[PDB]
Symmetry: C2
Subunit: 1003 residues, 2 copies
């Protein structure tokens, strides 16, 4: 009976000890595992009891390593990494990784032939080179994450190393079959078929299983166990079907699964994500520690009795050569691949060519070779050289990478840490001092040991002239970039931005920051919503043209019955090409009679269908009838009916792809617009030069106008996808705000924990259902647009009155609707097309669902902005006389005048509160939500005098000329009343009736 408990338990304990005790040291903890295994190996070589307890795990079957350890170690790497940045340039990175591994393997094999004195063939040398061409970027990515070189460079090298490991395993298997099992006699055509089976069919199987898994996972709500078990069983079944068919070369399939399931994380609950990540991390950790222990013991016991001085000399030469060729491949390949957008600097190339640590994949392959070799010296040489190279890398490179980085670019933390991390630690210290001073004046903690608290609560920092004009210009540019980054992050924390859009925006900000003089250029951002114009649009266009029983027999299972008949009939169809013939013939005749009477009924359909009717008639003609062997399969061509119902599914999937691109484009554009709008208000009081601030305002306005025009045209091009994405945005905003309300209720004590958990559960169910919505919502008719206006919704009589007196107007390109200075003819409502509103110095673009001329119909003022049609525009026109009639008709508390004045009041009051800036962090959304709570009260009830309390947070003058009760303080609209005022009255003037907007505090 084999003894394994002590070895596994001791490996776990020693891994914990080495992991905890080598946290601070720069050396990796795995070399400690290697030396511990070496000591255990020499002890077992001396002591027989330790040998008995060690021999059953130290010398295992090679299929344990090939079938259990390597799939886990590769799947954890594939599953752990983020893919949304790596899968943008997936094909090119795949090509780069494959080419690099192939060339490095060939140079290592040539070195193994000419330099080494062992009589080694090309197959043995190529397996040798494939072993020593598998790297590990863990140190490089760890030291590049915190240094802030790029978040788009660690993912690239991570994915490249993952593909490197996969192809290294594949070629190792290909050459191991030739070396150790030479009885096989596959030909050139068989080799080509095997290459097609490995490099194409495997990833396709993994992709299909992954797609089915996400499809079934998206329909499970509030069940963590079902999702976890389904995901794990799908992983095992993918591995098993790949393993029994492609042997160890069928790892690529599971790799693909690990990527695809990682990409579609929205169908997986976050608790399921964290559980699966920790699960696979623990499995890979156990495999890693076991591999290092067993290679240590088996390299001390066996491979250290057949070594000479020439072996050590060859190990040193090979260590030099692998570094030389690792530099050579990146020198000859990476500068050509400048299309990545992450062009190599002098520091980055040397960092990623020096931190090429070796890992446990090559050690496992060397273990497999040593097990398969037997008593031959080839396994001993393989294990000795692989272990020596791993040791040399893990010492020298892993300890000297930081020193090399300091030599290259001083390893300096730069500004992000120089200043930011200083602010936080200074204000954290001040808050802690304030809390401690509050605690010292308590009544119950007055006897606490304050030395202990003070010492154990503080934290530590982890880390005129043209020249003057250029200096303030650079300072203002850096300040604007910093403020834009703050705005993007604040938009993220409120749930108004997705993670990918925020990452794109901050990547553009960081790219523009380190340049000498470059702001956020629209051309870099334009590659977020322009990606629709590829083959998906053409494919959707091509499929658009292709597409008593049609209504009475119509149901959710009308054609599904025929589809079920096809699915039931494929099984007797498919057995002919792969006794029981009589029953199959009888059911064939029954189904043929059924479809014959179906076609007889369809003869009354007036032959409307052109393709499907002809194909069904041909099918019936074939079914009604050595040519017998041919006719046995000729009747089996009855799959012409599946492609009739498959066209909508392909249309749906191309709609999903277009929507997935358009959502990211819209998020990027909206975030940029909001960031510029906030930064223009922020930088107004932080610049001490009129020319500099004028230039900054000009460039910001130009960029914002270009972005908004492009977004409007993108909406115009395809309405269904735009309506779908905007609806999803609105629903996400509402759900996020309701979740915030739930959390605020829970914090105030008014909600128990279980009640809050139930409400949060309902909110998450609604979010998961929203994330699987239709990807193309049809645009609404203009009547729905007229009925859904903010000041018209809810009143059926008013809706009928306005709809009866409204007219439709159509305008072409270049027409002018209304010029400046003219009297207000009426009120517009854009229902189709973009339009440009320009006047006095300002210019904006209005799109569908927008209203023009509310101020003109309210205050009877002349127009002040010319409106020109950018496209063919359809508008709704309401005459001003009808608007006056409707105003004088409705006299309820939700008055037409009241709502009409409230809308323009909020619209004119938001910029004043934004420009005020008596605080910080007052975003446009939270300013708008603060102004929404406020209301205006007519002065007729209060005898034209208002008494000011301090319960108001802000008071704004939206109309007329103010007159306070002290010295008749006179102010002009629109203006934010000065903080130091008193109670104000008003005089009834028939020419102008002033009105004001007052906002209370939060209850």
């Amino acid at each position: 009976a084999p003894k394994v408990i002590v070895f596994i338990s001791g490996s776990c304990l020693f891994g914990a000890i080495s992991r905890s005790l080598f946290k601070k040291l720069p050396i990796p903890y795995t070399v400690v595992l290697l030396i511990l295994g070496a000591i255990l190996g020499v002890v077992a070589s001396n002591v027989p009891l330790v040998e008995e307890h060690t021999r059953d795990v130290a010398h295992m079957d090679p299929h344990v390593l090939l079938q259990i350890f390597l799939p886990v170690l590769i799947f954890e790497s594939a599953f752990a990494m983020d893919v949304h940045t790596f899968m943008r340039s997936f094909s090119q990175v795949c090509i780069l990784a494959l080419f690099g591994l192939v060339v490095a393997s060939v140079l290592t094999a040539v070195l193994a032939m000419n330099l080494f004195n062992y009589n080694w063939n090309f197959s043995e040398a190529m397996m040798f080179g494939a072993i020593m061409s598998a790297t590990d970027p863990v140190a490089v990515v760890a030291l590049l994450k915190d240094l802030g070189a790029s978040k788009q460079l660690g993912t690239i090298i991570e994915g490249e190393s993952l593909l490197n490991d996969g192809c290294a395993i594949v070629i190792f298997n290909v050459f191991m079959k030739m070396v150790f099992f030479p009885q096989l006699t596959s030909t050139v055509g068989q080799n080509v078929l095997y290459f097609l089976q490995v490099a194409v069919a495997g990833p396709l199987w993994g992709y299909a299983v992954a797609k089915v898994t996400v499809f079934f996972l998206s329909h499970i709500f509030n069940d963590a166990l079902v999702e976890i078990t389904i995901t794990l069983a799908a992983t095992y079944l993918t591995y098993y079907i790949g393993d029994i068919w492609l042997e160890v070369s069928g790892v690529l399939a599971v790799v693909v699964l690990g990527l695809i399931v990682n990409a579609e994380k929205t169908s997986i609950s976050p608790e399921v994500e964290v559980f699966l990540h920790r699960f696979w991390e623990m499995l890979a950790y156990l495999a890693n520690t076991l591999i290092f222990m067993m290679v240590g013991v088996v390299v001390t016991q066996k491979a250290l009795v057949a070594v000479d001085k020439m072996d050590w000399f060859y190990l040193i030469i090979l260590y030099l050569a692998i570094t030389i060729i690792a530099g050579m491949v990146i020198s000859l390949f990476s500068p050509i691949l400048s299309r990545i957008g992450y062009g190599l600097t002098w520091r980055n190339a040397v960092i990623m060519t020096w931190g090429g640590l070796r890992g446990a994949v090559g050690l496992a392959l060397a273990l497999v070779v040593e097990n398969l070799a037997g008593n031959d010296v080839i396994g001993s040489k393989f294990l000795f050289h692989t272990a020596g190279i791993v040791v040399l890398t893990l010492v020298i490179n892993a300890t000297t990478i930081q020193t090399l980085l300091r030599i290259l670019g001083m390893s300096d933390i730069s500004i992000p840490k120089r200043l930011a991390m200083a602010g936080a630690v200074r204000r954290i210290h001040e808050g802690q001092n304030r809390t401690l001073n509050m605690l010292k004046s308590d009544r119950f903690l007055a006897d606490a040991d304050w030395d202990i608290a003070t010492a154990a609560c503080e934290i530590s920092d982890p880390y005129p002239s043209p020249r003057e004009f250029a200096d303030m210009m650079e300072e203002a540019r850096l300040r604007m970039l910093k403020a834009e980054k703050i705005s993007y992050w604040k938009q993220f924390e409120h749930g108004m931005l997705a993670r990918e859009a925020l990452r794109l925006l901050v990547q553009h900000a960081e790219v523009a920051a380190d340049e000498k003089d470059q702001f956020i250029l629209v051309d870099d951002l334009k590659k977020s919503w322009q990606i629709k114009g590829i083959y998906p649009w053409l494919k959707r266009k091509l499929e658009d043209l292709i597409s008593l029983m049609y209504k009475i027999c119509h149901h959710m299972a009308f054609e599904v019955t025929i589809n079920i008949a096809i699915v039931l009939n494929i099984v007797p169809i498919i057995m002919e090409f792969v006794d029981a013939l009589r029953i199959s013939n009888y059911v064939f005749f029954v189904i043929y009679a059924i479809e014959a009477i179906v076609k007889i009924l369809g003869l009354g359909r007036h032959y409307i269908v052109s393709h499907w009717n002809k194909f069904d008639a041909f099918i019936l003609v074939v079914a009604l009838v050595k040519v017998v062997k041919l006719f046995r399969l000729l009747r089996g061509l009855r799959m012409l009916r599946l492609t009739k119902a498959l066209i909508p599914k392909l249309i749906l999937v191309v709609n999903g792809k277009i929507n997935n691109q358009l959502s990211l484009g819209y998020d990027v554009g909206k975030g940029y617009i909001i960031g510029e709008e906030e930064v223009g208000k922020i930088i107004d009081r932080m610049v001490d030069n009129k020319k500099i601030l004028r230039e900054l305002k000009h460039i910001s306005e130009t960029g914002r106008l270009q972005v908004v025009k492009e977004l409007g045209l993108l909406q115009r091009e395809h309405p269904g996808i735009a309506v779908s994405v905007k609806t999803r945005q609105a629903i996400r905003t509402i759900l996020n705000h309701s979740r915030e309300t739930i959390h605020e209720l829970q914090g105030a004590g008014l909600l128990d924990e279980m009640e809050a958990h139930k409400l949060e559960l309902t909110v998450e169910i609604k979010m998961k259902r929203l994330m699987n919505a239709p990807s193309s919502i049809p645009p609404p008719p203009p009547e729905n647009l007229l009925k859904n206006v903010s000041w018209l919704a809810g009143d059926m009589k008013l809706i009928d009155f306005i709809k009866a007196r409204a007219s439709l107007l159509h305008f072409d390109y270049g027409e002018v609707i209304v010029r400046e200075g003219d009297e207000s003819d009426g009120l517009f409502l854009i229902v189709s097309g973009l339009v440009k509103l320009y006047g006095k110095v300002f210019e904006d673009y209005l799109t569908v669902g927008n209203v023009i001329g509310e101020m003109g119909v309210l205050t009877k003022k002349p127009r002040n902005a010319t409106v020109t049609c950018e496209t063919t525009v359809q508008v709704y026109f309401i005459t001003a006389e009808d608007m006056n009639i409707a105003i004088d008709t409705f006299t309820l508390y939700p008055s037409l005048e009241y709502r009409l004045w409230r809308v323009v009041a909020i619209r004119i009051a938001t910029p004043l509160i934004m420009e005020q800036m008596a605080f910080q962090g007052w975003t446009q959304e939270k300013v708008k939500l603060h102004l929404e709570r406020g209301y205006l009260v007519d002065l007729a009830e209060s005898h034209f005098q208002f008494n000011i309390d301090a319960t108001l947070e802000d008071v704004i003058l939206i109309n007329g000329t103010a007159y306070n009760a002290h010295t008749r303080e006179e102010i002009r609209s629109p203006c934010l009343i000065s903080r130091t005022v008193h109670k104000l009255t008003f005089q009834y003037t028939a020419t102008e009736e002033p009105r004001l907007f007052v906002v209370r505090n939060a209850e």
Copy 2:
């Protein structure tokens, strides 16, 4: 080769299907698993291919069920439940569960003897009863959690059922050995020793392994993988060592390990807790579904071919009998055990005697019996009756428990849902409507489909006269209880309360709520800090009196060298009772010479120690020397030096127990005091009767005074533990507030996600290090108390000046220190003892570290409260003339006068802002932290006139008479200035100087 992949995969798939499809249905999903297994069993009995694919998992070895399935199913139940309420009355619940299972098993066995026609012995019948005496409370606890009957009743029944399952397994094994393996022979002594091995040694082994595991887990910081692997390996090794020694009776050891590890959750990171809980949940889920599938197929294939009508009749009679005896045991046992503090009602007893569902433990035992029986009909009868009883319970009881509850107590949701859940949903709806109205007036989402958003964003509700005087009295009492519960929850969310203290307080509130007329009585709360007065205090007292080389050779390894020598010498000592004798004798002689020269050196220690020197001399006398066999072990009695170093460890563990009790007591007392203090201010403006509010204020004041006096005496009794717990409270408060500051920085965009993660990591490391602090911090000397005063700290010259002129006064019980009306002699500082400050109608208790008479030395006003010594009090006295000299000496910006005025200003201004309550949700802590930011500015610099801005949040008049610039507004101190005021000036009056406190808004 066996085929198992299809069966396991289909079991997982069918479990997912049944679990998802039967969420809404009231029936449990496991009966669907049973019918699916039955259909598969009849198909395999017909079709041979399905039989080949089913027979290898359907008919497994019984040791797979005994060694893998039952340990997992019991450990998951033990590990999942919370224990801090169940382990309060652990021994009594254990006794109750054991007695109930024993009697019910007896009753069942008698029924299986007399009624059934099978010739069954006592052992077979007792194994039958042990199989059918194992229940499952899952439905009862699920329907009692949401109903809100009691949070202290679900845990009790959960633990009782867990112990029931464990003892059922134990007795099943005991009788299965007698039934199926009768070759063994048992005596009285052998059976007694086996009982001692099972019922004592196993739980002790589990407890010891658990203690070692928590000890090693508490020293690991920032390593999830190490903690997870150590915990899982500890679980396996506990199971293995218990297994190979006790067979299936190691479940007690693994249950003890699960409970003890779950109790000590503070040494385990929360991510580790959630991972381990999900891991064991998934394992138990797989075991459950597999067991139900194979019992279905086996009962269909085998047990359904040997049944008669009499078998069904006996099944019905047994189903009635098990319910009858389940009622009988709870009728005869539970009313006696009413000492737990959770008495049984009429509804609860019937609910917990009707919802006795059967589970997979009994099914697994029946499968084991069926496997062991062979071709005998006993296994068929066992499986048939067990499966029938499980089916009948899972249908009838699991579907009719809700109907029975609605018959008993209407299953009505009561008030907590009637009102609370209505407020939240109404408010949530209003917030959603506000957000939607904000979104409709946007510029980019103006074309969204608002019908879809409106329909998919709304949520649904889950659910004079004495009589008049009594009505308002009841309304006021319910309002006070609700406000107290809100205050306790708000204290929890701020981190000022622990979970156990909050649970105790809300349990007392709910207990007092449903009574006719009963407030929060101090006697119920007194059982939180009175639990010190048990044997731990006496044990600590008894151990207190027991306890050139002592300093020069002293180090961290001085006596540890001798301890290491003892640890090295036990191995040659212990082998005598269990060739190599010469080396052992030589090292014995070497160690004896070493300790002889140690005693020679110790001869110069003047023979100071009495016990240890005598024992060491006796050890040396023994070591310097068929009696040879006795002397071979006589020299082995050298374990008298470990108990010298073991006394401090036992003192430390009893200190830890005392501290663990005292922390809960202090938290309960502090939370009650704060809740009463807030509720007294809240209810002031919510009561419309002077008599009712006077009575409520009187009872609240009496309770608060009693609690604060008891807490002061508890501090007085033992200073070290009190200082330790108060220091831990202060450090926890500071760390929580710093974490809040980090989150607020992250929300405002000024901190990146990675920087915030690093700062949070440092905060969690500090919290984990704080949770493992010493449990007895020595009290400070009075000099440290004088140097740590809030208005004296930081100034070394002032500290020296005050310390030079301070005197120490000692007073006994009953003395009066200063009476009312007398002139202020000076300033006090309590450094030892409790003291009572009573005067004018008010009365309070002051403890160490408190200052009396600051107002008297500031404003030179006569004393207004007599101060009487409740105990022997040591105080620090500073003369008033020296205080005046110090005031007139220091003239820097931190003035003594300014600091004293700020302290008394915050002290006098906190109640005014507390009473104002302009915005609800104002806690005392937040009011204090808001007042801390404010400062007072002297009127001499501003020419005795102050200009009011609206940048102030609150203005308070702490001294003098105010005189505004309008009508010379006159107000008297202390008073909160009316919100409607203007800029005020002041006149220089030599007799009294008005001073005021102004607080700005948040930047």
